[PDB]
Amino acid sequence: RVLVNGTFLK
Amino acid sequence: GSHSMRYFYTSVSRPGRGEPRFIAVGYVDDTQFVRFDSDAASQRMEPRAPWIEQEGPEYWDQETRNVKAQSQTDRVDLGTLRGYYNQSEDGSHTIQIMYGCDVGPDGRFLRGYRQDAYDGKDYIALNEDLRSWTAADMAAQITKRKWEAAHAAEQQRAYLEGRCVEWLRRYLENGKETLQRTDPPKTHMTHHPISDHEATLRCWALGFYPAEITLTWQRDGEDQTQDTELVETRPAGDGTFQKWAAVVVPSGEEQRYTCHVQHEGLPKPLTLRW
Amino acid sequence: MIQRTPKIQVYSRHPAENGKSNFLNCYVSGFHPSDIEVDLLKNGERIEKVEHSDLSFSKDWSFYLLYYTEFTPTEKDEYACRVNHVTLSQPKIVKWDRDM
């Protein structure tokens, strides 16, 4: 499964 | 032996009108099991292996929503990085993100990974300790300090040691008949005259899984690398892999040459002679 | 920007024999950026409805793709793959050779 919230804004 | 779960994301800006092209792929070892493509009609995360199809409607609904949230972050980050590097609106740029976990043969966490690229070069990476970041330039330095303040490493580490390994273990069980199965290489050798005095010996390995393999040539029991050609390992398209190793030899002397095959599926290394 | 030239392999999924149903593969790898034009040809003509794998990449960030189609090898028909990318001086045609 993928990260729930995804990566943090760059 | 050891198993891995990896996710790969690619976001490409489309300066002429519209959102970027976003593609996400999930792998368990050398098997792709899911995909999301922003250009496809469904707009859903889709199964790419039979053993994942058994996941319920809410698994697919959540995977679809979570991967779409990553595509929006990528959309915003393409705009942000363009500013950091002082690039124009007219160009196409790329962000790549890879992350994943490795488990032992039993099922416990071995290691985690996370790394991001911009325009095909390293941008920012999570370090081996899963607690600190490596920024390749001053633009990535701005991101690192945002991520240090926001505790981004702690959320990535928690996923990698938690949910990542929990779900990889479930996948390994669900797809055990194929994921835990090793397919040894099917080997043969061919002979191709170049002239009446020289010939190529080609040693083939077909239908193997996993992709990891070693093909080496020996002349009279000593390692030969001169006049050899090894192609990169390639997908057969059915889940299996292929590779060949070739050597140019004097015609009449092909019995001096032996090809040696090493693969996880072979209880003992294999030898081929013409 | 960084530019990496594609490496190309053209081959069949199974050992090839004339008259026997198989799959013609064109594996493209080690390229950057991801925009690439890949075509499979039969006697210099584009095969329609050719499928491809989902864009993925290696540890060095370079891309790879597999393009494929069902085909039946013959003694007479010539199969090839045609690749175009920003890194090539001209479109690259790699012929299918049963022995490679």
Numbering used by the authors:
A (entry chain C): 1 to 10
B (entry chain A): 1 to 274
C (entry chain B): 0 to 99
Paper text:
The 10-mer NS1186-195 peptide anchors to HLA-A*11:01 by P2-Val and P10-Lys as well as secondary anchors P3-Leu and P7-Thr. P10-Lys is buried deep in the F pocket of the HLA-A*11:01. Overlay of the NS1186-195 and NP511-520 peptides display strikingly distinct conformations with an average r.m.s.d. of 1.7 Å for the Cα atoms, and only shared homology for their main anchor residues. Despite these striking differences, the antigen binding cleft of HLA-A*11:01 for both complexes showed little change with an average r.m.s.d. of 0.44 Å. While stimulation with NP511-520 and NS1186-195 did not result in significantly increased CD8+ T cell activation, some donors had lower magnitude responses that were still above the basal IFN-γ+CD8+ T cell frequencies observed in the negative control (n = 5 and n = 4, respectively), which suggests that these peptides form subdominant epitopes with HLA-A*11:01. CD8+ T cells stimulated with M141-49 and NS1186-195 were found to have significantly higher proportions of polyfunctionality when compared to the negative control. HLA-A*11:01 heavy chain was refolded with each of IAV- (PB2320-331, PB2323-331 or PB1659-669) or IBV-derived peptides (NP511-520, M141-49 or NS1186-195) and a thermal stability assay was performed using differential scanning fluorimetry. Four of the peptide-HLA (pHLA) complexes exhibited a thermal stability (Tm) of about 60°C, in the range of other previously reported pHLA complexes. The conservation of IBV peptides was 99.9% for M141-49 and NS1186-195 and 90.7% for NP511-520 across all IBVs from both the Yamagata and Victoria lineages detected from 1936–2019. Therefore, the crystal structures are characteristic of the HLA-A*11:01 B and F pockets and give a rational for the preferred residues observed for 9-, 10- and 11-mer peptides eluted from HLA-A*11:01 molecule. These structures represent the first insight into IBV epitope presentation by HLA-A*11:01 molecule, and their diverse conformations suggest that a diverse T cell repertoire might be able to recognise them.
